[PDB]
Design a protein around this ligand. Structure first.
Ligand SMILES: *CC(=O)[C@H](CCCCN)NS(=O)(=O)c1ccc(C)cc1
Length: 676
């Protein structure tokens, strides 16, 4: 009964002589210090509560259904690192993992490093960003988010007696490494207002952080500061990264007074990363090709890099792991992840087959290089997430664990890789899955999912929650659209900057091909995207509103032009080589044509559920809030338009193994009611 009507306070923004009027600009508050804002967000939540009350039963049915799939007890396969065996445990009803370990010689008794349920201690949000035991096995460092804004606290535990030290490192990125003395930690501090990771500090454990020494400050705010430690343990790396360009600095992990030593000075459009092992640096670099190569060197000097793997236009080299006798690399070709092993001596090459049309494989955690046992991951649209161990020499493979899914028989579902020819003749890969026994050409609701930014890939993986749609006749689709990484670096570059419109075109083209070929019911087409996938949702409903019956747009990036004009707002300065720099006229004009907030107009929009989190640090809460306000004022349809603001979460929604399914049940009930 009557949606809330945002206050209008005309706010002009002038760039290149173009004045845009933002009536809803006031919805932005930089602390949360304006009662007017909360009142709007609270009123939208009350309208959403009232409007979705009918589905109360169906939500609790789906919640209960999704929870019923999950083993209540869930134990990881143990591993051994520096004389200790480690395991991660959920016990019945637990929202968060318990991390335990024991001496390698021991079997009966395990010690608790940390209990997430104890640490979460009543709070609506908790994330362990990282935990790591000192090289001397005496101390534990943990990075925890208590709020959901990804401002990680770092704290330290004495493992001998399970006491905590007095100090906390605040507003960190959660990225840290131990010096080899186990007394010092290096860690990354975030800018107080932009939240950009920009400073490395040295901290002596057990001391006041006011005494922490600044080691490196990144002067160019288009870059991110991270920390890594090499396989050799000789170096802690300052990894400075941006869209286009890398630089690594070495810190001697064996010394207390290390200062950053330059590896290779930054060069525009040269991305590199390194490890150190067997006395050599191993470099993944795009110096000679966009799809990257792998290089070995005794020295930093780029002229000395020996080619191990030459860049191939057909193969994206993505990642690598170093063993005693084998190099193992993660590669992508024909839209599919593979792993390849190369013997350092014989140069013999072996590849890991998978015949599934619709899977992902990856290097899992391998704590020790001195072994012939590779642990690697596998998941598909039809096979739950699996941990394999491969003997690299004998080829024998053992399945260590497959995720148990209750109330599920894989033989009931089938998946396909389909190729869709886009409006410009370019072939776009699609992964889809459905329940065979309920499938009939032309009759099944479609759920089409896209992201398509940053060269991130929507790799086909198993979802247990997704069975709630598959078991009600849905065909679930991953559209591997340009801007994503699915076909290598050129696929990414062909969907950003002056090519970003290809992301949106590709998603429409895939959706129309699928309806034309009878995979979906033309009246029951749903789409979902989050964050950069929310940009996708926003652009496609402006451009092709009548295509979709209903839309879920999570933490959506929609105020593109205003956001990219403002260096004060988190992530802006790091994304000029993604969308463009709208201080430049060409970029301003190109981006304005798709910026969803700016292109809302008087037309019929599909049914829409917009979700955000008040603390969201990547897409600030006001973008979706403004976008809903402006949609409510101008839309000509009277279809559902709901805003759900979670007051106690951020970019990744509700924390907790079971709690997360509250958001998915709400989303899926909204879609299922429209598919009745
Ligand atoms: C969650 C998401 O897609 C957001 C959108 C942020 C838009 C900022 N104006 N991106 S992110 O911050 O999570 C992010 C994810 C991957 C990469 C490579 C960069 C940023």
């Amino acid at each position: 009964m009557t949606p809330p009507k945002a206050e209008k306070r005309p706010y002009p923004i002038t760039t290149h002589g173009d004045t845009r009027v933002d009536d809803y600009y006031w919805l932005r508050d930089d602390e949360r210090t304006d009662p007017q804002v909360l009142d709007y967000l609270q009123a939208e939540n009350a309208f959403t509560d009232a409007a979705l009350k009918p589905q109360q039963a169906l939500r609790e049915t789906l919640y209960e259904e999704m929870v019923a799939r999950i083993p209540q007890q869930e134990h990881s396969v143990p591993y051994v690192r520096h004389g200790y065996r480690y395991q991660t445990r959920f016990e019945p009803g637990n929202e968060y993992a318990i991390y335990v370990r024991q001496p390698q010689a021991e079997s009966e008794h395990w010690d608790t490093l940390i209990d997430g349920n104890q640490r979460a201690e009543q709070r609506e949000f908790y994330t362990l960003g990282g935990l790591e035991v000192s090289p001397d096995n005496q101390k534990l460092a943990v990075a925890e988010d208590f709020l959901s804004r990804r401002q990680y606290d770092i704290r330290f535990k004495n493992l001998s007696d399970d006491s905590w030290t007095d100090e906390v490192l605040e507003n960190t990125s959660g990225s840290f490494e131990w010096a080899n003395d186990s007394a010092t930690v290096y860690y990354v501090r975030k800018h107080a207002k932009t939240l950009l990771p920009y400073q490395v500090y040295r901290h002596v454990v057990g001391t006041d952080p006011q005494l922490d020494e600044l080691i490196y400050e990144e002067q160019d705010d288009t870059f991110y500061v991270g920390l890594e430690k090499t396989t050799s343990d000789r170096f802690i790396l300052i990894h400075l990264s941006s869209t286009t360009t890398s630089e690594i600095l070495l810190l001697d992990a064996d010394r207390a007074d290390s200062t950053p030593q330059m590896f290779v000075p930054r060069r525009k459009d040269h991305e590199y990363g390194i490890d150190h092992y067997h006395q050599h640096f191993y470099i993944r670099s795009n110096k000679d090709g966009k799809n990257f190569g792998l290089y070995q060197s005794e020295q930093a000097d780029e002229a000395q890099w020996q080619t191990l793997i030459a860049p191939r236009i057909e193969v994206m080299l993505e990642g690598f792991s170093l063993f005693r006798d084998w190099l193992v690399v993660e590669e992508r070709s024909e839209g599919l992840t593979q792993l390849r092993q190369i013997h350092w001596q014989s140069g013999e090459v072996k590849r890991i087959a998978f015949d599934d049309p619709t899977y992902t494989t990856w290097l899992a955690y391998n704590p020790e290089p001195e072994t012939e046992l590779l642990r690697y991951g596998y998941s598909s649209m039809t096979t739950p997430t699996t941990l394999y161990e491969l003997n690299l020499d004998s080829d024998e493979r053992v399945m260590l664990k497959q995720q148990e899914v209750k109330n599920f028989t894989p033989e009931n579902y089938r998946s396909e890789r389909v190729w869709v020819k886009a409006r410009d003749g370019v072939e776009v890969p699609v992964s889809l899955v459905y329940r065979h026994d309920s499938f009939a050409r032309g009759t099944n609701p479609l759920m089409v999912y896209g992201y398509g930014s940053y060269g991130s890939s929507m790799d086909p993986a198993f979802s247990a929650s997704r069975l709630s749609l598959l078991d009600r006749g849905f065909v679930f689709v991953l559209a591997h659209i340009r801007g994503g990484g699915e076909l290598g670096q050129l696929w990414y570059e062909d969907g950003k900057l002056f090519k970003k419109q290809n992301t949106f075109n590709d998603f429409i083209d895939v959706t129309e091909a699928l309806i034309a070929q009878g995979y979906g019911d033309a009246k029951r087409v749903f789409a979902m995207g989050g964050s950069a996938g929310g940009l996708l949702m926003g652009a496609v409903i402006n451009q092709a509103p009548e295509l979709f019956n209903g839309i879920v747009a999570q933490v959506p990036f929609v105020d593109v032009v205003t956001t990219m004009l403002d260096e004060s707002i988190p992530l802006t300065t790091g994304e000029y080589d993604e969308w463009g720099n709208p201080n430049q006229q060409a970029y301003y004009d190109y981006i304005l044509q798709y910026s969803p907030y700016d292109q809302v107009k008087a037309q019929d929009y599909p049914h829409m559920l917009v979700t955000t989190g008040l603390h969201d640090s990547q897409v600030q809460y006001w973008e979706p809030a403004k976008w809903v306000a402006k949609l409510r004022e101008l839309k000509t349809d009277d279809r559902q338009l709901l805003l759900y603001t979670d007051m106690d979460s951020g970019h990744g929604g509700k924390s907790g193994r079971f709690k997360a399914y509250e958001d998915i049940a709400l989303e899926y009930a909204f879609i299922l009611a429209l598919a009745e």
